[PDB]
Amino acid sequence: RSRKESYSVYVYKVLKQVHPDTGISSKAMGIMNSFVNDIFERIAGEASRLAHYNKRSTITSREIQTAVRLLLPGELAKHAVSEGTKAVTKYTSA
Template sequence: MAKTPSKQSAKPPKKAGDKKKRSKKRVESYSSYIYKVMKQVHPDTGISKKGMSIMNSFIKDIFERIATEAGKLSTYNKKATLSSREIQTAVRLMLPGELAKHAVSE
């Protein structure tokens, strides 16, 4: 009976200097969405890297404010779940006049 060759792993042996490659930590950004909306509203307009950074910070700040306010509203009403009603009320409270009306209508 013929002897079958022993199975060896396809991986080369590890060297002392080899280290696992770390994956980059993902950075939360709204840049792609800001760009898409900007192109819908003003197709011929561009935005600089610094301008995009400012818009991204602005969106993060507004999101944080609305989420905090909605959380307070749900706490006042003794509810554990944030519903669209709390978000809508928070938007009305946080955004001024016409902007709030437009945001709620969307």
């Protein structure tokens, strides 16, 4: 195969981390799978246009950080930006 699957293990781990003794249902897994792939082509799709508008072709961390404030609203955008900055800091530290 060419690796075309589904987000199930990570979703279950996140659900168990945020809520113990919980789980996902039958159609809920497909709903979350279709929701992940929908925003995956929306955030990454705007970064390409934003890089092409400035005569560039490098989508780094700032290209994804700036795209958060465009798609996400207000408080969720700042929270996602803070989480991404903390993640990139923990990545660059070690």
